[PDB]
A paper describes a structure:
Acetyl Coenzyme A Carboxylase (ACC), an important enzyme that catalyzes the first reaction of fatty acid biosynthesis, is biotinylated by biotin acetyl-CoA carboxylase ligase ([name]). The Mtb-[name] molecule is composed of two domains; N-terminal domain 1 comprises of 7 β-strands (β1: 29–32, β2: 55–59, β3: 82–88, β4: 124–126, β5: 131–133, β6: 137–147 and β7: 150–158) and 6 α-helices (α1: 13–20, α2: 39–48, α3: 95–114, α4: 173–176, α5: 183–203, α6: 206–215), while C-terminal domain 2 is a SH3 domain with 5 strands forming an antiparallel β-sheet (β8: 220–227, β9: 231–240, β10: 246–250, β11: 253–257 and β12: 261–264). The two domains are linked together with loop L10 (216–219) that connects helix α6 of domain 1 and β8 strand of domain 2. All the apo [name] crystal structures have revealed the presence of disordered flexible loops, which undergo a conformational transition upon biotin and biotinyl-5′-AMP binding.
Numbering used by the authors: 8 to 64, 77 to 161, 168 to 265
The structure:
């Protein structure tokens, strides 16, 4: 499997009117997110910045990237939709090239892209104002998880995949920034979770079981529990 071509990616995605201002690829690092936070922490403006790592402390079998966004100009109660928008971007960028029926793949709230029941990719948002750092990990050539390879992509072009992924990610971030109602609708159309019976595990061995009915303006899960609405903030759920 070839390495990423840093130069080609830059020619493609930067700049004008692209929202990506910078992009770097590094052979190795611990976290893409930490590296980016370190940079902001130290006074860097990381909005629009992409960091890709060939390996995170096997190498080059996943696409791992992180992006930075300035969120401060957006209402704090909509930040929660940013990590959701990111998964949609991953599913969208990867669906066209996939053997399975689109219906078998979907979004699992709040962090996961699933194909045929197995985790294709994960999303990690960490906030650090004025920024949020979105981290993506997609299994290209890798518990019970899955990869584009297992999914029929015979030879995946990480360069092409990363490139498409950044393009959708840019599209969704824009929609999120614009309070676009389509982002939420697109997210619902592809949710595995909505319409599903789910259990939410809560600290202390507590759990709630209900039917996921919607996602609220803040990105939280709405459960129908016997006709009462219970809303939960981002956390982990199990389908049933």
């Amino acid at each position: 499997r070839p390495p990423l071509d840093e130069r080609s990616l830059r020619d493609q995605l930067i700049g004008a009117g692209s929202g990506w201002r910078q992009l770097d690829v590094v052979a190795q690092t611990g976290s893409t997110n930490a590296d980016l936070l370190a940079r902001a922490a130290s006074g860097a403006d990381i909005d629009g910045v992409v960091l890709i790592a060939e390996h995170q402390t096997t190498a080059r079998a996943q696409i791992i990237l992180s992006v930075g966004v300035r969120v401060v100009d957006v209402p704090v109660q909509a930040w929660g939709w940013l990590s959701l928008a990111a998964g949609l971007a991953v599913l969208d960028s990867v669906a066209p090239l996939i053997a399975v029926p689109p219906a078998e793949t979907g979004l699992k709230w709040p962090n996961d892209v699933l194909a045929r029941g197995g985790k294709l990719a994960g999303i990690l948002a960490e906030v650090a104002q004025p920024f949020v750092v979105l981290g993506v990990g997609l299994n290209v050539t890798q518990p019970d998880a899955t990869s584009l390879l297992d999914l029929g992509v015979a030879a995946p072009d990480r360069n092409r995949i990363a490139s498409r992924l950044l393009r959708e990610l840019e599209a969704r971030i824009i929609q999120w920034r614009n309070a676009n109602p389509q982002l939420a609708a697109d997210y619902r159309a592809r949710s595995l979770t909505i319409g599903s019976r789910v259990r939410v595990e809560l600290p202390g061995g507590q759990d709630v079981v209900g039917i996921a009915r919607d996602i609220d303006d803040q990105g939280r899960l709405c459960l129908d529990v016997g006709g009462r609405t219970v809303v939960v903030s981002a956390g982990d759920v199990v389908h049933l």
